Design a protein around this ligand. Structure first.
Ligand SMILES: CC(C)(C)c1onc([O-])c1C[C@H]([NH3+])C(=O)[O-]
Ligand SMILES: CC(C)(C)c1onc([O-])c1C[C@H]([NH3+])C(=O)[O-]
Lengths: 258, 258
């Protein structure tokens, strides 16, 4: 009965509340997806338990074992009933799990330490002094791996064989790398996160250029789940009521530090 | 075996080709949705016939008769197998027809004749000199009718009883009204159309302020339709290959013009 929700510790979607060490269950967390989960459960009429994904990954199919990891894996193998996180709707994923219509729109973007002489993806691909990478096991990495667009294919061929590795395990690692590399590392991540980080101290990073593509985040459920329909309608209702815009303003700018 | 596609004459989505009088079938038309339709059909493996919606409407449920009109109506009552056009994904529509994930992201926006002293929805609501309205039988009108955001509800309250009516039968009517009203009429329509018009002669209109909401267009099919799955996957694949961005750049090609 209690719906098992798989999510990921990614600010400001899901974060440990200040006094979390002495809190239990859902009360240990806070964030945009924590609020969204509450709204969805309310509209769909179910109780739930937020559970952080074991491997801390979004979801990718291992070319080798052919096994799915991350939150996608938790759904595919029946460990969770639903995923409420900034999970990107993609073709390979839609083939194994279901997604509600988007609750947020975004696109891949470039994050630089302020002052870095880079304005676009093309700029990056035409130089080698500044390294650049992306997150492991995510849609952004897969985007570059599959891209047939000249500039992106060129960037991928570079990234895939760069040393030391330009790929990071978590968004926090990528942000730290941009911040500590004196402008010698640029990070590729989704726009809304780029935007969120530009609002965090020490306010030394920024988004450059336009988005490389246009996609959306969706609430995912196992293929053919009984929750699919109700969740989808709930997301549409919440968006039309303006709750999603409200949630965005709350966690991004009302709590901004720059 | 031929799929009946319902669509609407709306530039640059679907337009009559030059010399269309001597052409027949699908060859009579050109535009973003015409090209999209060709791509979708190619990926899903089906032949199709483009048909222009009889009442020239997007789709709304008649308050009193309880009857869906426009392209939504054509799907609901079995007149068409699929709708390929700038049809907004909404809750009320999703309750009676199915939508693929969005193939385009956009939002409601404001169109003013250049020079109009208006910069936002709030500016519009705080005055009465400049009349403002929207398209009938569409998602934008329903947005205001149902919005509880003070500003939008305030706008709805004024629009509902203004004289002469601020609502128009077609987009062309609303645009023409902005252009002929010497700045005394502002029009509410979706962003990508506003931007399309802003780049064409006589170059006397412009989009002002940010978008009022965020949403997308989706390819629609009757509820439970067998075509649903394939069309959805096709849209995701086309977006991931960059075809959707290519079509946008093609039909919004900065035409020479302003
Ligand atoms: C952390 C976040 C969300 C900003 C992100 O930035 N680049 C990515 O690949 C992802 C993960 C992506 N949303 C997914 O679902 O794989
Ligand atoms: C004409 C177009 C497409 C610019 C538009 O702009 N405001 C609207 O309401 C619509 C129609 C809407 N997409 C729908 O499906 O009702």
């Amino acid at each position: 009965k209690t719906v098992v929700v798989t999510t990921i510790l990614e600010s400001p979607y899901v974060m440990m509340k200040k006094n979390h060490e002495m809190l239990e269950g859902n009360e240990r967390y806070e964030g945009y997806c924590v609020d969204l989960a509450a709204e969805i459960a309310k509209h769909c009429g179910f109780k739930y338990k937020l559970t952080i994904v074991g491997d801390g990954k979004y979801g990718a199919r291992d070319a080798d074992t052919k096994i799915w990891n991350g939150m996608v894996g938790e759904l595919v193998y029946g460990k969770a009933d639903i995923a409420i996180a900034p999970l990107t709707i993609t073709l390979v994923r839609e083939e194994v799990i279901d997604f509600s219509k988007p609750f947020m729109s975004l696109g891949i973007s470039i994050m630089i330490k302020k002052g870095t002489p880079i304005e676009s993806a093309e700029d990056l691909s035409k130089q080698t002094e500044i390294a650049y990478g992306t997150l492991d096991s995510g849609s952004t990495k897969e985007f570059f791996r599959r891209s047939k667009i000249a500039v992106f294919d060129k960037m991928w061929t570079y990234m895939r064989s760069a040393e030391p590795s330009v790929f990071v395990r978590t968004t926090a690692e990528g942000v730290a790398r941009v911040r500590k590399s004196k402008g010698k590392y640029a990070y590729l991540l989704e726009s809304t996160m780029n935007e969120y980080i530009e609002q965090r101290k020490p306010c030394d990073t920024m988004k450059v250029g336009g988005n490389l593509d246009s996609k959306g985040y969706g609430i995912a459920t196992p293929k053919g789940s009984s929750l699919g329909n109700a969740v989808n309608l709930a997301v549409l209702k919440l968006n039309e009521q303006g709750l999603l815009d409200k949630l965005k303003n709350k966690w991004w700018y009302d709590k901004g530090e720059c």
